[PDB]
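Bug report (template v2)

What were you trying to do?
Predict the complex of my protein with protoporphyrin IX containing FE.

What happened?
Run completed; filing so the output is reviewed.

Input:
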Amino acid sequence: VHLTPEEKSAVTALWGKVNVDEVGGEALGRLLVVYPWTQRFFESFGDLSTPDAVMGNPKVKAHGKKVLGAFSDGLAHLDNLKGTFATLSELHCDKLRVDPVNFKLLSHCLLVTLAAHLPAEFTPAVHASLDKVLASVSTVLTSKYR
Amino acid sequence: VHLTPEEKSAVTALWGKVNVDEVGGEALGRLLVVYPWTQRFFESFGDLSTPDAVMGNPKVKAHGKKVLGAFSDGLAHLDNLKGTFATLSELHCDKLRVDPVNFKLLSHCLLVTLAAHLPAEFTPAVHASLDKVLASVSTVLTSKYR
Amino acid sequence: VHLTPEEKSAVTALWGKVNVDEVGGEALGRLLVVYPWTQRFFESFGDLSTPDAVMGNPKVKAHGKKVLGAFSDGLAHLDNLKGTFATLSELHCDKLRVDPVNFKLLSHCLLVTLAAHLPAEFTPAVHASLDKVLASVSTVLTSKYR
Amino acid sequence: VHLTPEEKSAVTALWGKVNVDEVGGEALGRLLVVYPWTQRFFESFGDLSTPDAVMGNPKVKAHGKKVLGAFSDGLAHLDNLKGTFATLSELHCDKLRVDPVNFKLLSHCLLVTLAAHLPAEFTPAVHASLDKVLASVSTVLTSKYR
Ligand code: HEM
Ligand code: HEM
Ligand code: HEM
Ligand code: HEM
């Protein structure tokens, strides 16, 4: 993540319009629907057998809202991503064994969801800037592996 | 592709609302802005140094339309993708040396511009159907490396 | 696979020197030691916490032999890979939810143990032929996700 | 890269037996042969049209020896990988546009080459340790992208 003042401000502005309740559950729901192998991490959540099932699942909705929260907290502290996400690095890596590529797939399901929700604001350059913030947050979460 | 009738027809239905001019250019434009290393393939196109520079660049837009037209045709030969993208596989593999990964990144830039242009239509289920078609077209255009 | 007679016969020839017992176990063992997140799929096997622990573990070795035997059979149906790995595709995709990426990582752990066991035979050209077969078997075992 | 004293010593010992002249050219030669799209970065080098052509190419041989050198220098300074490879980050990223995945493919072609050359020494644990050193050196070389 190497953001200029102009990039930080444009992602900041974008993010200020994001409804965290509805974008997080939709982002996590698209990962389980589109990339169906991710469902093995969330079977405790219940029935995920159809799109309708996934998107209706309140455990999904609630957890997704927990994810975006953590991410906004990441955005308030670009300068200390490693400090901010250190404990989530151990949960995901040492306890949950979340495969590194899934962080990238979740990143992808978040950018498709922000584009459908904020079409005017999700320009090629805000896309580029969020893509390297999301890339560095994913580097920090898989750091118990290297 | 393991498209059920519903999946295939939902893809067929969203695709008819796509404005090829508008979407092919932005899709290729987001590839070049977000994943800058891909610019080495399109040096020929002239100025690509700023988001505005690659987005409005007329070669980008032209090419964008050509990429989507070949995708439209592939969509109508869903049962025979291998056969339809056969000469494009030699071009990309043998003549152009395009990394397999870049086809995955372009597919992702396309799902993002589609989400932004058709938000109401871009439901998690058609996003999943479209990702499968996109993945199949990618394994076929990458055929001549394996 | 776009195996020329020479490629197919060179693969056929190296494969006949492979000691399945010795190589299947070490291949799966290197997956689990090098990419630890894969251990979540084989928790059933008991102790996998140390390199020595996963390497000598008898379930690892047993399974290793089973994975290579299915690969031997796939090799002798090079022309019909889709057909031969068909029931193993449902198992890995629908029942086990194995990430597509893990098939690429296992293929890599196998090329490394093969290099080590057959160094004189593991020439860049048979390494390339073997990587193509491995890639084709992977796109087929991943069929039921696309 | 999080190496214990025991890991550092075991990679150190391994590396002390590596013939840098012959392992670097073989590692770079396997990347161009096996992953043929990488040849677009090295066409100035000449004829790379066959395995025989690639492996005989002295520009390949010499460059490969330049790569491993840089890598041994990386190994002498784990504690400052970012300081050591900062200029190579700008050459590869801003001047050469080397796609991030190719760093991982080169890593892979180096581990297959060390296994064929030092079979006794290339144990599952030295493999695991070199894999995360190589992973972090590749993170540092693609850092102009994030
Ligand atoms: C890339 C951004 C990610 C962030 C910021 C993140 C954040 C979180 C947070 C805040 C928690 C702890 C709170 C809770 O227990 O609900 C958590 C739990 C968890 N995360 Fe992640 N996570 C990320 C990616 C992933 C990915 C890619 C997966 C796997 C597909 C994953 C799987 C899980 C699971 C299984 C739990 C436990 C859920 C439960 O039992 O309620 N996470 N994550
Ligand atoms: C989604 C898959 C893709 C499709 C359907 C596709 C389609 C096309 C088509 C239709 C042409 C043929 C132009 C002609 O000869 O008439 C072409 C050319 C080309 N493609 Fe692709 N392509 C795809 C992905 C890529 C990717 C990922 C790259 C590299 C980043 C790429 C780079 C090129 C280049 C450099 C040319 C020729 C440049 C020029 O027009 O002067 N293509 N592609
Ligand atoms: C190179 C491709 C692979 C082949 C040819 C292969 C082959 C096999 C075979 C033959 C079985 C069937 C056992 C039976 O029902 O009789 C099996 C089971 C299984 N495979 Fe794979 N497999 C491959 C890759 C993977 C990967 C990448 C993973 C995950 C890291 C995986 C995880 C499993 C698991 C967990 C089982 C069942 C566990 C048990 O034996 O109790 N496989 N595989
Ligand atoms: C992962 C380890 C890598 C290291 C340590 C590394 C190191 C080097 C070094 C030391 C040079 C500068 C000296 C010279 O000009 O010969 C160089 C040049 C270069 N590297 Fe890399 N490199 C790495 C990966 C890659 C990869 C993956 C590619 C692309 C497939 C690549 C492509 C090039 C090219 C094209 C040059 C210029 C060669 C010439 O014109 O002579 N490098 N690299």
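What did the reviewer find?
Residues B 38, 41-42, 44, 63, 66-67, 70-71, 88, 92, 96, 98, 102-103, 106, 137, 141 surround protoporphyrin IX containing FE (ligand 2) (CB under 6 Å). Chain A touches chain B through 23 residues (CB under 8 Å).
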